Design a protein around this ligand. Structure first.
Ligand SMILES: CC(=O)N[C@@H]1[C@@H](O[C@@H]2O[C@H](CO)[C@H](O)[C@H](O)[C@H]2O)[C@@H](O)[C@@H](CO)O[C@@H]1O
Length: 146
């Protein structure tokens, strides 16, 4: 199983920074959209749904630093969850070789350029053998002040 960020080099596990351009101005009560689907893409490494990868986001995924106290929501594979995550999400299944934009959006209801605003833990386990489970962490960093 593999992922990449902004067409970058392949990622098999670990921590990766994900950089987003946000609307630099808001009135409170109006929520911000962080579409991560535009930055993170993932695919199956063999294809044909031969050894299907099973992906979900993990309990403990939360806002970081500046936004720690904020409440928000997280959209994942056709389902919306309260954010920070208090449970695991539904499972997204990936078996094609053509990169798939992660169906992941973060909504947040005072951001400084270059800070980590969310840390999203993602779990992977496949179907065949042990499934060779892997963990991913996406540290979401705002490319502009907001
Ligand atoms: C251990 C490992 O990463 N092997 C690489 C293969 O990874 C496998 O990919 C399938 C489908 O995604 C599934 O995730 C397995 O659990 C995983 O091990 C694969 O990337 C191949 C591609 O040539 O290289 C290694 O063998």
């Amino acid at each position: 199983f593999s992922c990449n960020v902004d067409g970058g080099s392949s990622i098999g596990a670990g921590t990766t920074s994900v950089y987003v351009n946000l609307d630099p101005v808001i009135q409170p009560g109006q929520n911000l959209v962080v579409d991560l689907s535009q930055h993170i893409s993932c695919w199956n490494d063999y294809g044909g749904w031969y050894d299907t990868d099973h992906i979900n986001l993990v309990q403990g995924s939360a806002f970081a630093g500046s936004l720690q106290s904020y409440k928000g929501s997280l959209y994942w594979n056709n389902v919306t969850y309260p954010f920070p995550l208090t449970t695991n999400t539904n499972v997204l299944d990936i078996g094609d070789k053509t990169p798939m934009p992660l169906p992941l959006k973060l909504y947040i209801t005072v951001i400084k350029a270059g800070e980590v605003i969310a840390r999203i833990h993602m779990y992977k386990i496949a179907t065949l053998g042990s499934g060779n489970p892997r963990n991913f962490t996406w540290n979401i960093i705002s490319n502009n002040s907001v």
